Amino acid sequence: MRKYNGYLIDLDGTMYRIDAASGFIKELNRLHIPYLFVTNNSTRTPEQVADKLVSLDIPATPEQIFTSSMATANYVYDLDQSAMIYFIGEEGLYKALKEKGFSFADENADVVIVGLDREVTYEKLAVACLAVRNGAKLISTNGDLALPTERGFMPGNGAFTALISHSTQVKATFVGKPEPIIMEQALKVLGTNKNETIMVGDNYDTDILAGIRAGLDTLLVHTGVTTVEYKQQPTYSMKSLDDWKFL
Amino acid sequence: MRKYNGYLIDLDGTMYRGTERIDAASGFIKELNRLHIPYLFVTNNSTRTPEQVADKLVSLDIPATPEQIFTSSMATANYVYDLDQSAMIYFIGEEGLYKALKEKGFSFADENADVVIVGLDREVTYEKLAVACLAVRNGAKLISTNGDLALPTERGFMPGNGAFTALISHSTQVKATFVGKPEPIIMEQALKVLGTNKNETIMVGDNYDTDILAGIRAGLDTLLVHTGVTTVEKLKEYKQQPTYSMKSLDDWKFL
Known part of the structure; x- marks a missing residue:
């Protein structure tokens, strides 16, 4: 049985700005591991975001998209x-x-x-x-x-x-990121436990830091903001998603 | 013969609140005109023209020309131009x-x-x-x-x-x-227009946090009017204080 059977994946400079992410997602579906895209974007609808991913050979449905708009709308509803x-x-x-x-x-x-x-x-x-x-x-x-x-x-x-x-x-x-609220909400949606879920991102200031405050393990890929060049390190750090071993 | 031969009069604060302060300002300004002492109005305002402000002042029996109104917008433009x-x-x-x-x-x-x-x-x-x-x-x-x-x-x-x-x-x-106030740059630019020396010029206002503090930082003597016992106590614990504190413009000796 796998260590991580839940994947929260960033869009902001991670899934695109590349097909290394396409193969990464395809593999996730072949291993039948459920995932959920998380973005700080508050302008597009989930249906719109999903189509942009499909347009880049990346398997995505509107239900697999979780925006800060959706997270905020949910959060205020609770109050x-x-x-x-x-x-x-x-x-x-x-x-x-x-x-x-x-x-x-x-x-x-x-x-x-x-x-x-x-x-x-x-x-x-x-x-x-x-x-x-x-x-x-x-x-x-x-x-x-x-x-x-x-x-x-x-x-x-x-x-x-x-x-x-x-x-x-x-x-x-x-x-939204790096605040834990958007992560807590997305975790409920994904449906996996906190110790079996890993957040994947390119930017430490948003993605990685959001996972840490949420209590999630993190994968930092250098296809975006944060370079190889902080107080808490990510759980994993790689050049590409091609180096991920699906632990 | 005079210590202060140049005046910088604040337009903001509550300097002209009520008929009393308006007339007290009118007599004060008229006296400056009576003694041929150069003076200049200073403000952070940007919703009015110098022409507009001057027209309102003269309406309240306060003698002022558009050339005697100095805003932070004017100070900003002049400060950048010289650079x-x-x-x-x-x-x-x-x-x-x-x-x-x-x-x-x-x-x-x-x-x-x-x-x-x-x-x-x-x-x-x-x-x-x-x-x-x-x-x-x-x-x-x-x-x-x-x-x-x-x-x-x-x-x-x-x-x-x-x-x-x-x-x-x-x-x-x-x-x-x-x-603009409380930064000193607006007062420095005001001095350029007023034309008098820094040590022979006094800024007059009734608000410390925004108005008076700008003059202090610019190296100008300052007069704080419309003050009481309590407020002077407060200021005596600040790092910097106004040069003078009075209840009214009526109390000011021209030196």
């Missing part, structure tokens, strides 16, 4: 199902919140959720600040400061979360 | 900041700007903030007109200039140079 919500974000966050059946408000909201909105305005940020000062909770989908695009490093959701927090002097509760 | 006349500028802000940079005959640019200037823009967008981040990562200097995190309005506390500076600074991991 108060009748909570009226003001949110900043796009399609992905909006859908997940609506499927959960939340109502929506503005300055008089109970919970403020901060997701990436690449068309955010001063007024959108203003309503968020006003609601928080009225007593509303401040939740953020992810704390990523920079977003890698063709133009360069665009401002991430963490930066906009910083604005709101600074102006209101209220610290925010982050859901 | 680099050929600096290509991207800025986030409104009418006041735009006009201030216009007066300097700058060239403007986006992602390849040499200097990024952040001021309050109540119609800011993701793209506006994104361009700022891109330019900074392209090596542009990050300058902020002021650092106010919150802005008090009818609706409550709206996000201020400092909050947006924080976004850009956090995203690009580059620290910002703040010009």
Whole structure:
């Protein structure tokens, strides 16, 4: 029997930016090991994310995708199902919140959720600040400061979360990586125990650190952010997924 | 013969709250005019033009010209100009900041700007903030007109200039140079315009944390009005204190 029969796999620079990941996933299916993709992305729906993976010869279904949008929508539901919500974000966050059946408000909201909105305005940020000062909770989908695009490093959701927090002097509760919350939620979905599940990623600051705080073993592959060049080391560290022995 | 032959009058704080302080300011300013003592109004504001502020002052029987109004946006523009006349500028802000940079005959640019200037823009967008981040990562200097995190309005506390500076600074991991109070740079730039010597100039305000502290850091003597026993006690435990503390502008001897 295997040591790890559960796999939480990162998308942000791990599954792509390559077909070394395709063979890795194919093998996981041949050994019939269940897995679940985890991403700090709060803009795309799971169906959208899954299609991008299939487009790169990577077996993925919408059910095998777990976003910070879904994790946040689940997390807030636990705190108060009748909570009226003001949110900043796009399609992905909006859908997940609506499927959960939340109502929506503005300055008089109970919970403020901060997701990436690449068309955010001063007024959108203003309503968020006003609601928080009225007593509303401040939740953020992810704390990523920079977003890698063709133009360069665009401002991430963490930066906009910083604005709101600074102006209101209220610290925010982050859901996505490296916070353990997104890992705890994904683990319930995957259905495997904490000691038989390993988190796979490329970035120590998000992926690896999320697994450690969650109590999960970690595999660090250098196909992304963190180079071979910290206080807690990952459980494993390799150049490629080709070096994984499926322990 | 005089110790203070140059005055820098704060517009912010609660300096002009109520008919009493307004008339006390009017007589104070008129006396400065009566004695031919040069003076200059100082503010962190960016929602008004020097023309607008001067028009409001004269309305309240307080003699002032647009040339006697000095904002942090003007200080920021002048400070950058003296450092680099050929600096290509991207800025986030409104009418006041735009006009201030216009007066300097700058060239403007986006992602390849040499200097990024952040001021309050109540119609800011993701793209506006994104361009700022891109330019900074392209090596542009990050300058902020002021650092106010919150802005008090009818609706409550709206996000201020400092909050947006924080976004850009956090995203690009580059620290910002703040010009407005309580930073000394705005007062240094005010002295340039006032024309008097630093040791012969006094800054007058009624708020320590933002207004007065800027003058102290700039090396100017400071007068703190609208103060009581309790507040003076507080300040005597700070690292720095105002040079003088009085209850009213009525109490000020011109030296």
